[PDB]
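Posted in: Protein Modeling Q&A

I'm a second-year student putting together a small comparison for a lab meeting, and my supervisor asked me to include a predicted structure for Non-structural protein 3. I've never done this before, so apologies if this is the wrong subforum. The sequence is pasted below exactly as I got it from our records. If anyone can share the structure token output, I'd also love a short note on what stands out.
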Amino acid sequence: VNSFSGYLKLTDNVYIKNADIVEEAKKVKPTVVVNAANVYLKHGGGVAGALNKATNNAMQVESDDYIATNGPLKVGGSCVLSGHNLAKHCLHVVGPNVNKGEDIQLLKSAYENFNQHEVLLAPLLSAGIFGADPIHSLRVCVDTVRTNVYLAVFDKNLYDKLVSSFL
Ligand SMILES: Cn1ncc2ncnc(NS(=O)(=O)Cc3ccc(CC#N)cc3)c21
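Accepted answer (user: helix_wrangler)
Welcome! Here is the predicted structure, written out as tokens:
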């Protein structure tokens, strides 16, 4: 028994809620919140900018030090950094951005990172400003992640469409 509330059950291990991931993080303070990162960990907009703003830019400061030491992530890759005031840890995961020509087949590799964590609060990878088909992202999530994932999807029209079209 964990502290996530009002999530709707999709499968044995995947749950979904119509919510802003930052609001969920601040209320739950989960062990792991997933960021929809890019390879440079430049958190300007979308999930990354919303989370970073909620940390008062501390996420960006930590991320810049990480990149200066380690170089960029891979598309499909991830790193674990602090969750600051939102979570114990933030798992920064790079989904393919279809707006930059990045291979959609890398979405499965991106979701595989979630399997290294028993429970995660996460957004729908490559959705919204990343330009991928969201029904597709949810399908890949369900078929790839085996650990317990709590999805927060800001868009009500997206949330209703995702639930009502789910197979
Ligand atoms: C950006 N942002 N900020 C907080 C937060 N929490 C959960 N989801 C987010 N965005 S999202 O993952 O891309 C899901 C999403 C949101 C909106 C749309 C509209 C279109 N078309 C499509 C898809 C969030």
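A couple of things worth pointing out for your meeting: DSSP finds six helices and seven strands in the chain. Residues 119 and 148 are 5 Å apart (CA to CA).
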